[PDB]
Amino acid sequence: CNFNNSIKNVIVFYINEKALIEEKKMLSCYENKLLNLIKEDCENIMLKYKPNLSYICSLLKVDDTSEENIKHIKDQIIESLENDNRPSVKLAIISLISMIVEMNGYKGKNIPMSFLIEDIALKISENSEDLINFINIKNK
C-alpha cells in the first residue's frame, strides 16, 4: 500500500542520531577522556595497519552480510580475543570492527551486528587494568 523506504531510512537515521546525542551527554568526564584516547589510537591503527585489516576482512568475507556469516565473523573475533587478549590486539579489533561498519554500514536493523558489538566490547573490557595500562602508556 504505497510504501517509501527513503522515508523509513531517514526516520531510522534521525531517531538513531537523537539517541547517539543522548548517549554522548551521558558519558562521564572519565569516559569522554577514554573515548578520545581510543579514537586517536584506533584511527592511527586504521592508517598504519589498513592492509592487515583489509586482509582480515577478506578472510572473514565481510562483504557477505548474511545472518549465517555475520555470526561466523563474531565467533571468529570472539575466539581470537580469547586465544590472544593483549590490549594491542583488543585495539586492533576495535579498528577492525570500525572498518567492517564503514564497509557495509550499520543502522541497528541488523541485530546480529548489535550482538557482535556488545559481546566484543564486553570482552575488551575484561582485565581492564591491562588495557588502561597499555593505552595511557601509549599517550606518554
Partner: peptide, 21 residues
C-alpha cells in the same frame, strides 16, 4: 582459516607492542 586470522591479529599486536617501546 581460524589460525590464519589469529596470525594476522598477532602480527598487528606484535607490531603495536614493539612500537610502544
Amino acid at each position: 582459516s581460524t589460525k590464519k586470522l589469529s596470525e594476522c591479529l598477532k602480527r598487528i599486536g606484535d607490531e603495536l607492542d614493539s612500537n610502544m617501546e
